[PDB]
């Protein structure tokens, strides 16, 4: 139930053509923040949440476009960057832990993180077309201390727009150079 603003700023200092670009790891997606559930502890207890995320839960999200279909995005990304399809066959685990402070309650929730790939079409200044792919990476926990009387900011529980919890990146490769 929220949103930001964007008028412009799509300038790209590179020649005409098509590019596959790694936009970085650590992306979290809108409205799915609490899908995996959350965890409550208190009074010096250590809480641990994790996941051994395999092929059947590592769902990629494709956002294709007129000239860039899903297969095209997949192949160009997997040729230059990590082969996520192959990697999905080998289970990897991650977990977070935090100790609830003394005489207080702690709430912790988990969500998946992603690597964002884009496939862009450019005309010597600006992006004319952009396809997007989110590849499942790992995960990320938000935590907060609370009591029953306390109101919590909406933005803690809920992301309305995709963002990166790390620094965004722009690592490019010209395709059909």
């Amino acid at each position: 139930l929220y949103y930001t603003k964007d008028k412009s700023i799509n300038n790209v200092n590179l020649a005409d053509g098509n590019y596959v670009v790694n936009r970085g790891d650590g992306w979290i997606l809108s409205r799915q923040n609490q899908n995996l559930g959350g965890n409550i502890s208190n009074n010096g207890c250590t809480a641990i949440v994790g996941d051994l995320r395999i092929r059947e839960t590592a769902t990629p999200y494709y956002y294709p476009t007129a000239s860039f279909n899903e297969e095209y995005i997949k192949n160009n990304v997997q040729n230059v960057f990590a082969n996520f399809t192959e990697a999905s066959e080998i289970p990897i685990g991650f977990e977070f832990s935090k100790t609830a402070p003394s005489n207080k309650s702690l709430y912790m929730y988990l969500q998946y993180t992603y690597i964002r790939y884009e496939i862009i079409k450019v005309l010597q200044n600006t992006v004319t077309e952009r396809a997007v792919l989110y590849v499942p990476s790992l995960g990320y926990v938000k935590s907060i201390e609370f009591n029953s009387e306390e109101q919590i900011d909406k933005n803690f529980y809920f992301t309305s727009q995709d963002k990166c919890i790390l620094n965004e990146k722009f690592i490019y490769k010209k395709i059909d150079d």
Binding site: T4, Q32, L36, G38, C45, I48, T57, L110, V132, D162
Partner: protein
């Protein structure tokens, strides 16, 4: 008994985490941890099966499967009765005291409502299995007096932090039209015949970021506009709207009341996708959606429905009942004063609200050739049941903007009093 300041439709409400049933019905178990010892309770997911809990006021329509489909529309929840997410609690007892470690399963409570005319007609409650709760405390005395207590009422309590997040979803029994080309400054959309049989949504986006006036021809019926939640960033085409099937929608402005002749002034952004809900129109003549980019300070109405007020030739009471905006948001009213335009004022006007409190600003709407312009005439701190009279020029057009400051009732009532 809160008021929900929203139009008719389906809504999914996340009512928070840490829900569990009474009488230790979700108790996994308790560890007694001796001083200088650590104890641990693990949910290792050796089996993936989880057991969601479900209630509904209408099993036929709001079925578990249906409710799940809406949870997916709203929050993109994939898995309902499985999980690969482990949880674990570790507690080390101090050297002086022993510790009781009590762990429970928990659920996240989602509420699907069918909201009609300020009322919840149907309600489903879906309890998504969650990542548990741990209570650590001083170990009880095994010689503690046994108190005979009755089993308490059968239901749920919440042990997690306060949460109430509302996400509207596209009504999936209403169809979606799409304007593929991003709209220019001036666009007219012909509404298809299907509108005769049920309401529909129309998905679109603007070519240039700016303020837009949106209305039907003759300003009837009233419209509703939404943002698609999460549509920003993501796939884009210069000359084409990129549909990414986002069914999660954020209400901006508009209403259902069939007699609310009106238009919408809304700030729209290039990177976002929007939905307009056109209600069913049983008329056999073709209706239109008219978009019009607006330069100038008409932007002051930034996201509001402008209610056009009519037949106030008579004197005294003129009540208009409309769906109230939430606290902080706008509802506006347009008046063209009866009589011909020279510079005489019409039997002075006095503006008050009757259910909800608000701030309120009176504007003079000009017609000078650069678009429209607004001149501020006056502001009022309080609108409810108290207000001072003011004289307005005959044949002049005024707009009265209300900014809601307290929401006591689902509807806000507006009174344009013509005293003398």
């Amino acid at each position: 008994q809160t008021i929900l300041p929203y139009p008719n439709g389906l809504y999914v409400i996340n009512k928070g985490d840490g829900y569990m049933r009474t009488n230790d019905k979700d108790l996994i178990g308790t560890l007694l941890i001796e001083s200088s010892t650590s104890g641990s309770i693990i949910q290792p997911r050796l089996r993936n099966t989880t057991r969601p809990l479900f209630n509904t006021s209408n099993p036929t329509i709001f079925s578990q499967e249906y409710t799940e489909a809406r949870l997916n529309d709203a929050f993109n929840i994939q898995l309902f009765n499985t999980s690969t997410t482990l949880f674990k609690f570790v507690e080390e007892a101090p050297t002086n005291k022993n510790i009781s470690m009590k762990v429970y399963n928990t659920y996240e409570k989602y509420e699907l409502i069918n909201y009609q005319n300020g009322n919840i007609d149907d309600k489903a409650e879906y309890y998504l299995p969650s990542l548990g709760k741990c209570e650590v405390s001083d170990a009880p005395s095994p010689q503690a007096p046994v108190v005979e207590t009755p089993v308490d009422q059968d239901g749920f309590i919440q042990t997690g932090p306060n949460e109430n997040i509302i996400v509207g979803v596209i009504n999936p029994s209403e169809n979606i039209e799409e304007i593929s080309t991003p709209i220019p400054d001036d666009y007219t959309y012909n509404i298809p015949t299907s509108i005769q049989n049920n309401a529909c949504y129309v998905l679109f986006k603007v070519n240039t970021t700016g303020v837009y006036k949106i209305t039907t021809k003759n300003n009837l019926p009233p419209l509703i506009i939404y943002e698609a939640i999460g549509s920003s960033n993501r796939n884009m085409n210069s000359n084409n709207l990129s549909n990414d099937n986002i069914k999660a929608i954020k209400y901006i402005t508009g209403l259902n009341r069939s007699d609310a002749k009106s238009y919408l002034i809304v700030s729209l952004f290039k990177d976002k996708n929007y939905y307009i809900r056109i209600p069913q129109i049983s008329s056999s003549t073709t209706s239109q959606l008219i978009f019009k980019r607006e330069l100038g300070n008409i932007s002051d109405l930034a996201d509001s429905t402008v209610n056009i007020l009519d037949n106030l030739n008579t004197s005294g009471t003129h009540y208009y009942t409309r769906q109230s905006p939430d606290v902080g948001n706008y509802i506006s009213y347009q008046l063209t004063i009866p009589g011909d335009f020279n510079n005489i004022a019409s039997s002075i006007f006095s503006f008050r609200t009757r259910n909800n409190q608000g701030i309120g600003t009176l504007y003079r709407l000009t017609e000078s050739i650069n678009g429209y312009n607004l001149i501020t005439i006056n502001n009022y701190s309080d609108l409810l049941n108290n207000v001072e009279p003011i004289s307005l020029l005959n044949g002049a057009t005024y707009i009265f903007r209300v900014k809601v400051t307290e929401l006591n009732n689902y509807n806000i009532i507006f009174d344009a009093y013509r005293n003398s």
